[PDB]
């Protein structure tokens, strides 16, 4: 049995996305870590053999046989190192992997320069359909969803590009029926 | 590497659904996993070489077979929504603990085909303050109301597909029991945004079912299909 440290993690474009596991047999092996982008399946991204460190790019692993524990940690993480990581361990050649639980990590833009929005947006091809875009909103603001049975937040969306500056953010809303004003009572932090 | 087929798959409760993974690799050994929540994977049965297949940690509604040693099959018998998912191919052999994987097939199973429909993609285009206060220009794409959510969303500039800018939701949301929802965001410079030449599409790819299913409606059938909302730049 094999488990795995956050069930969930969004990080801004520059944390230390830090992964941790846990096997049972304190003599398994080998530790392997899977990376699972969307669209493909687990590739293998990095192994522990034995007892310490191993760097490898902006990656490192620490693994503790007496503690039971490998950790993934990621430095400078990127939009682009988002996926679901898989923890499995081959305690043996001749064993198949006992695999764990998974941990989907997110890398959220990082908003260096807060500068909150309510924007409203209007769908072009008519109707009377808008919604509403918060944007450029502080690391820290977190987002649940809304008052009633006829609205909808989003919360923070997820970056795919390793490379701008202009990697649009925001969370958006949009309600069904014309009256809800586009910057409600929100059920969330809000910050000025 | 490896393949799979389907990508995508719906079934009604009772199905003969087959899964087909195939490694035009040499491996000697094939897998086949599934991933829920909460589950990283778990796996059904395995091949250790064509001929027998053997067992697995969840063989229960499943069955396969290894016709070939580049082709193993698991079949789902009489389906159930149980059994709706992701599932993952693998092929490994001795040479490494490290194994190879197929890229997924996403399986729903429900009780009424019926209710299987390809989502309303809405493109929405920049605020004015946004444009003029933060010389920038975010379009937001939205797609509602489709089932299942076998899809992928992606924007087109100008005929070329993008990435940088473009930021989307991770999972979609349920809407409602069947109806789910996504949405995505496209940040350019409103310089940019007002060339009146430059031309953006939000383009969703749905994965309804196959032409071989029955679809006795009063409406067209929800077949696998991109569906786009389109928007030029504007000057004011």
């Known amino acids: 049995k094999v488990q795995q440290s956050p069930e969930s993690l969004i990080v801004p474009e520059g944390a230390m996305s830090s992964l941790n596991c846990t096997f049972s047999?304190?003599?398994?092996?080998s530790i392997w870590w899977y990376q699972q982008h969307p669209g493909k399946g687990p590739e293998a991204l990095i192994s522990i053999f034995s007892n310490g460190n191993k760097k490898e790019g902006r990656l490192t692993v620490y693994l503790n046989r007496a503690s039971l524990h490998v950790s993934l940690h990621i430095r400078d993480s990127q939009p682009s190192d988002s996926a679901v990581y898989l923890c499995?361990?081959?305690?043996?050649?001749?064993?198949?992997?006992?695999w764990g639980s998974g941990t989907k990590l997110i890398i959220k833009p990082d908003i260096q320069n807060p500068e909150p929005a309510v924007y409203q947006l209007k769908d072009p091809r008519s109707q009377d359909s808008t919604l509403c875009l918060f944007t450029d909103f502080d690391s820290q603001i977190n987002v649940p969803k809304t008052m009633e049975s006829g609205t909808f937040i989003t919360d923070k969306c997820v970056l795919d590009m390793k490379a701008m500056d202009s990697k649009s953010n925001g969370a958006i809303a949009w309600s069904n029926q014309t009256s809800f004003t586009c910057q409600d009572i929100f059920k969330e932090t809000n910050a000025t | 590497a490896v393949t799979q087929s389907p990508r995508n798959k719906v079934a009604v409760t009772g199905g003969k659904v087959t899964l087909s993974c195939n490694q035009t690799?040499?491996?000697?050994?094939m897998y086949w996993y599934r991933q829920d929540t909460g589950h990283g994977l778990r796996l059904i049965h395995y091949?250790?070489?064509?001929?027998?297949?053997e067992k697995g940690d969840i063989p229960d509604g499943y069955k396969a077979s290894r016709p070939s040693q580049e082709n193993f099959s698991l079949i789902l018998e009489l389906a159930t929504p149980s059994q709706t998912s992701v599932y993952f191919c693998?092929?490994?052999?001795?040479?490494?603990?490290?194994?190879?994987f197929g890229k997924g097939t996403r399986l729903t199973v429900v009780e009424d085909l019926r209710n299987v429909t390809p989502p309303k993609v809405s493109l929405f285009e920049p605020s004015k303050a946004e444009i003029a206060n933060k010389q920038k220009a975010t379009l937001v794409c939205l797609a509602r109301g489709f089932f299942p959510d076998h899809v992928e969303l992606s924007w087109w500039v100008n005929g070329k597909e993008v990435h940088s800018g473009v930021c989307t939701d991770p999972q979609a949301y349920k809407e409602s029991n069947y109806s789910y929802a996504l949405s995505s965001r496209l940040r350019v410079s409103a310089t940019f945004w007002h060339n009146p030449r430059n031309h953006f599409r939000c383009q969703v790819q749905f994965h309804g079912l196959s032409e071989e299913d029955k679809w006795p409606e009063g409406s067209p059938k929800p077949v696998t299909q991109n569906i786009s909302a389109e928007a030029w730049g504007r000057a004011d």
């Open positions: 693998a092929s490994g052999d001795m040479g490494a603990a490290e194994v190879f």
């Open positions: 690799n040499n491996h000697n050994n």
């Open positions: 499995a361990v081959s305690k043996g050649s001749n064993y198949q992997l006992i």
């Open positions: 047999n304190s003599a398994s092996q």
């Open positions: 091949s250790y070489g064509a001929g027998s297949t």
